[PDB]
Amino acid sequence: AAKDVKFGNDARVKMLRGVNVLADAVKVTLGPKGRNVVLDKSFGAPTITKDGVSVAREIELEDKFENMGAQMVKEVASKANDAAGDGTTTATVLAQAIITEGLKAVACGMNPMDLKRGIDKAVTAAVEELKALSVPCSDSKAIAQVGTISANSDETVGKLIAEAMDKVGKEGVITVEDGTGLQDELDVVMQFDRGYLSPYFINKPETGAVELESPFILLADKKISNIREMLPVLEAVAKAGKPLLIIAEDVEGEALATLVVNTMRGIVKVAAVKAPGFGDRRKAMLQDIATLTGGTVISEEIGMELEKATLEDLGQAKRVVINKDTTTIIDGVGEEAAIQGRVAQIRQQIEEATSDYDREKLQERVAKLAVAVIKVGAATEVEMKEKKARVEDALHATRAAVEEGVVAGGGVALIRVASKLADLRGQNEDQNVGIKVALRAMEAPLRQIVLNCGEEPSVVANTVKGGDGNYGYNAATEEYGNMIDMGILDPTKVTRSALQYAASVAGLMITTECMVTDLP
Amino acid sequence: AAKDVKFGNDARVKMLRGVNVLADAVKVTLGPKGRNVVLDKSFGAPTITKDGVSVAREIELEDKFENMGAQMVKEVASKANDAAGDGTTTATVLAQAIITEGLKAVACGMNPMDLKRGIDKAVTAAVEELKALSVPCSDSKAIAQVGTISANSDETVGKLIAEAMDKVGKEGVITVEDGTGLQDELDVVMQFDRGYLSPYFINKPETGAVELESPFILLADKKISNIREMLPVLEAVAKAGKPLLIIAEDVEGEALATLVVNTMRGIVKVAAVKAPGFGDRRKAMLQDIATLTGGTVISEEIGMELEKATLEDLGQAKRVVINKDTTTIIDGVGEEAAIQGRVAQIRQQIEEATSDYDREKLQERVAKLAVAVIKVGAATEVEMKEKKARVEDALHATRAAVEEGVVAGGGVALIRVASKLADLRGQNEDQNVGIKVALRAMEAPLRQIVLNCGEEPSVVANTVKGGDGNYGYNAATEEYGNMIDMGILDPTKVTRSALQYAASVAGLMITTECMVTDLP
Amino acid sequence: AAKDVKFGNDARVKMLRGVNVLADAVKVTLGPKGRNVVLDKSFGAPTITKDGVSVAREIELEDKFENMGAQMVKEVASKANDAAGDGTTTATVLAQAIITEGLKAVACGMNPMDLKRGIDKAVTAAVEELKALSVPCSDSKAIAQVGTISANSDETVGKLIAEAMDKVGKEGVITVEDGTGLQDELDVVMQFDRGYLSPYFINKPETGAVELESPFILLADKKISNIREMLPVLEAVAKAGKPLLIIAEDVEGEALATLVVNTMRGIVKVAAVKAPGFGDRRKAMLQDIATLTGGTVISEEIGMELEKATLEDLGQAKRVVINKDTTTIIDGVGEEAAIQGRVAQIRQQIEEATSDYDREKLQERVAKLAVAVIKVGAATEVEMKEKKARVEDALHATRAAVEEGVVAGGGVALIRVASKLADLRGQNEDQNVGIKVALRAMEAPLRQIVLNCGEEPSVVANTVKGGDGNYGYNAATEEYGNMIDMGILDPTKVTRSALQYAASVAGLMITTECMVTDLP
Numbered sequence A, B, C: 001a002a003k004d005v006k007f008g009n010d011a012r013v014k015m016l017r018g019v020n021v022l023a024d025a026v027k028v029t030l031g032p033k034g035r036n037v038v039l040d041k042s043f044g045a046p047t048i049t050k051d052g053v054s055v056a057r058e059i060e061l062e063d064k065f066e067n068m069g070a071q072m073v074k075e076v077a078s079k080a081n082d083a084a085g086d087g088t089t090t091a092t093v094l095a096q097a098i099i100t101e102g103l104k105a106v107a108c109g110m111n112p113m114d115l116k117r118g119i120d121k122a123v124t125a126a127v128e129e130l131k132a133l134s135v136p137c138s139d140s141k142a143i144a145q146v147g148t149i150s151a152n153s154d155e156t157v158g159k160l161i162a163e164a165m166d167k168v169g170k171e172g173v174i175t176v177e178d179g180t181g182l183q184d185e186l187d188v189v190m191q192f193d194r195g196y197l198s199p200y201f202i203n204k205p206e207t208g209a210v211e212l213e214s215p216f217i218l219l220a221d222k223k224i225s226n227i228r229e230m231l232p233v234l235e236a237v238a239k240a241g242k243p244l245l246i247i248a249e250d251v252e253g254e255a256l257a258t259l260v261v262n263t264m265r266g267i268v269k270v271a272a273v274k275a276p277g278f279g280d281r282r283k284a285m286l287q288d289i290a291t292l293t294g295g296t297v298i299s300e301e302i303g304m305e306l307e308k309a310t311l312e313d314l315g316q317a318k319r320v321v322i323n324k325d326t327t328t329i330i331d332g333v334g335e336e337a338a339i340q341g342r343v344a345q346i347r348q349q350i351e352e353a354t355s356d357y358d359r360e361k362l363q364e365r366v367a368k369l370a371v372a373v374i375k376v377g378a379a380t381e382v383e384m385k386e387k388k389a390r391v392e393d394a395l396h397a398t399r400a401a402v403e404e405g406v407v408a409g410g411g412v413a414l415i416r417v418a419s420k421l422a423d424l425r426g427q428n429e430d431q432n433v434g435i436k437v438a439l440r441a442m443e444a445p446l447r448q449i450v451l452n453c454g455e456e457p458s459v460v461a462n463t464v465k466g467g468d469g470n471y472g473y474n475a476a477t478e479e480y481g482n483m484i485d486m487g488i489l490d491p492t493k494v495t496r497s498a499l500q501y502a503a504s505v506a507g508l509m510i511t512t513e514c515m516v517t518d519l520p
Ligand SMILES: Nc1ncnc2c1ncn2[C@@H]1O[C@H](COP(=O)(O)OP(=O)(O)O)[C@@H](O)[C@H]1O
Pocket: A029, A030, A031, A032, A034, A052, A086, A087, A088, A089, A090, A091, A149, A150, A153, A408, A409, A410, A411, A449, A473, A474, A475, A476, A477, A488, A489, A490
């Protein structure tokens, strides 16, 4: 289509106006005295949220150029989220603060492409300075604090996540789901998403689930349809007394029908459940189970018949629990040598994972061998969703603090790094201004946090910069102090991520001399 | 699409204006001197109703922001309904009254997120205070009163529900349907909607129905067409003397034809009726019958032939009654262990029911095992529907009073709790104002009830607050007295639910600093 | 969609304006000096009609609220029609007259919900008072009068319906159809809609019909295709001399072909006709015939072969008449014990009929055992349809007078009841006004009838109220007298029905404080 083409200052002013709308909608949620944003949503009720990326993703403006502005800087907030899990508002606030200052310089005749070089240099330095300030965070008290600050000063959420990480370990997974109840709730477990195939197996109608006591476990790679194949193994289990779980690709009617009438009567106690997964991942996961239980995968492809299996090839467990949705193996017989060998193998499979998706499902399996769910409580569903948004953010920050340490919150970390880089220069004057642009932007987080409390950001900024180390402003309590002593901890990873991403995008945005878009 | 983005006070004023339209449409129905709302309805006649949620669900406003207001607070009324069954108007009135007072504070510079904390704290306290005031309600007189007040002072409805609960018990179900007649009507019963397949079975032409005395019961999952399958079992029943009921998927002509000539002559006494339901629900229900009668479901799918059944697999009952429309099994042989085991299973099936429809049919079956129907009478159909709306509400309130006690109605319960929390404070001033916001809102129900009588709400409120305990205003009679003595009982569960839900939503709504929606 | 929401007086004024349009279109047809309404109709010619519900059903207004008004009160006219069959205009006139007076009171500050209670009480009383005044109506002269008044003073229609009810009895059915001729026409009949299957059976080419003299009757449930099955019975009829009628599901070619050549020659005299009905109704009706004729239904389903039938199982009749369209059995051998037993069975089948359709076909069969059609004559088709509309109304009123007696027409019945309830009071003042609202409305029918004659309704009303008993205004003749002596009879059922339904709806309509509808 025919295009509208704008140049120079006109293009930039539009680009900014756009940035500001997105920025201005997100910035209002920053900090403990941050407020919430309402996002209308076509199919049913609107959403109240503090989560900066959530606000950002919805912004789209009418004016084709302004929109372009907002649509580019939206990526800062968005990428922060995909890497860190928190800091999305901070990231957005920095980005604005750069873009704004940079463009002002561009208008003064300075060469954008150098302003960029400055900014980028100042940031590469700031990243390293932050790694210096970073003190690690591994005790449950520190983690609970990060969690708490991350969930907008909700101590329960901190406490609860800290408890969770303590229980699953570090090679273990934590999810968050909507609770039925009014208060928060933590559940801890190997399990996979498969129910009984035969609802006539439930041996405890109390729970509506099958509870096989100290059973054998048959791992069939192929899908079963004839009871002939089972007879040899079913026989040895019938003369052993112990029950049996059958985890094959599928238990077809002809061979299912029978199995039912056999437990129906009490001849053998057997359960049938599909195999966890699809394709090569199934055989991989099915193998994981064999290792935990000390059984052999009866793979039809690698020269085994299901009839030539014996008690030998069956896994064993202390207990088994299966319901309409999930199957759980409690404490398998498999030796911990074989297990941790199998784990350090899958651990290096995640190293060569060049795609995120290949990494997801792999660490899921290592957690099954080395898992927890937090259920979020609230009165209504508008409440549920702002709370659940905070819990996720908190969990992310906690995992990030663990893996990269913490720094003083209240945006002081950045303010310090800015004073430490006060001597940084570039190859020429424009690059210098570029550095100074970035350093001045580093104050923005603190400044906005203070501004959302309705106090004079210049005055607070000055007072924090007059101090040392972890002296900062506690926006919640409205007085100064030692941020680490007051539990106001941001993960290093998030503060770093915010800064890097804002800089990346904002840097480029300053180099805009022409804009091309469709006509209205 | 391009979005309209509004901030701060503008956004809030719009949000309120919206809340008020919904609120203002619902509030007019509050209390005995409440009036009705007419809701136009595209396909045919309009609806007259007092039921506050019904009005709420229809509100949708033109202005995109105002709508957002109304669409959020709509959830208060809506959730009250899903939890309690009554109090939806009250809930809505509170919500408004909070939002309004809170936003006024937000405009005074107070920190919304703290106003929220206050409100929420005041409410958590009020919930506990209400549990103190709650006296239980288990005698039929008290229940009839709750029912009566709930049905806008209709004593018949109270009386009739009280009678119903007395007869079904507490582990028994009550439904409401449109009556054909002009006056109300209660019917009480395991039974299901299926008649005889063969009209030539009626062994008592007095009633035009089959009355099988102390019979066996055959439960066939598959549909029958050949008499071959029957011969083995039919044989053992023919040499046992006792009659037989056959409840299979269907009794086809070839196998039906015969069965007739056999009872025709007196060789065996047999009835044939289709199975209750369709698909997986049929097999589920067919199984319920087996448990009540001590029989086995002869399921062709899970490896059973109909020929290999014996007297073993047949259920038994004390008596059976079947007519053109319904089949009734009176007092089955099944052991109450197996029954209540089967029930506590279906009881937890209703827990995981995430859809309303999955909940309906499940509790229907538990009533068949552990049932009454109220038919509502009215002259026209406009009348039918407002009445039926009141009966449902009443029934809900009665069931809620039973399970959580009652408190003094006329909104006095809340007014008392408010005087008891007069000393409640928070961590800081903004939180205090937040508490006071909630306590002042607690007066709104009484105030609106009085205002719908066209009398001075301040004057009545003052006079009730000057009193003690259950002193209140009786809006119907226009004079003060002891609300429990005057039968003006609200269930605790509903009063609590109203307050909790209003607070949840309204709390969040006060934290609004930005709104994002589509352009017009 | 976005809604328009109106409150209080605004909403009510709109609601009324709507009611009035519908009311005002219907009221013009009231009474003997009533006029007609023309209803445009998309597919072809318009409709002229006096029938008040017919006018009502077409009204739909542009203004969304006014429409709501009209759409609710439309139900009065509509329900009157479904219950009574006449009085739809009267009902509509009352409804208006209540709504109007009630709303005026609501505007004076009186509590709508009490105004309702008053109205309803006054009506429950009026219903009983009317049952007092009701004198029964069973002589043909009285019925002819009701019919006449009902058909807007058309004596022929009265006379003709009176003759009809006299001939079919009270357990007999009357239909009305369009006539081919220019004048009205009554036809009277056991018979059913089936002709000969074989046109080569007509033994009297004068009429073009088969006249079997004193024959046997074979009732075959199954459909016949082979002459083998017939031979046993056909044999015994061939050696008996008497002819035979065969009423089976069908007489197929192979078995039809033969039967023809046998009567063709004079070996046996046989007729073949399909069975009356479809499905379970066929077997039911086929059974009715067996009872009237003293034969057995040879039902293949309940263990009978057609070959094992003998003269035993054949019905018998005095004469049989069959043409291209219908089969008639004149005076069957069946004993009147068995017949009236079969009838009092089908009579109670119509009691449990909860659907209108289940009632239609049942009383059709009782008439066949214990039926008439009125053909309406007119010149054109515009004429046909107003006339046919009056005949139906008349027939309905006659059947209603029969079942619930009559009262003095000209709306005097209601005027009397109003003077008798002059002392009725309620629990409080608002309820009193509510009663007075209803009593004043009871004058409206008379008042409107008089007003359609262009005479002063107040003056006539006063003069009738000054009188006693059945003194009334005869609007046709324009002078006063004894309404029963002048033949001006309304059925009690209709007068009662009108009042009850108007009150039901109008009562509720007065309680309107808010209206919610879509935007324009
Ligand atoms: N009590 C406090 N005083 C000062 N700063 C705080 C306090 N609590 C949290 N913060 C800071 O405010 C920041 C707010 O983060 P948040 O508003 O969730 O946005 P983001 O998406 O950037 O995490 C945190 O980095 C933290 O350093």
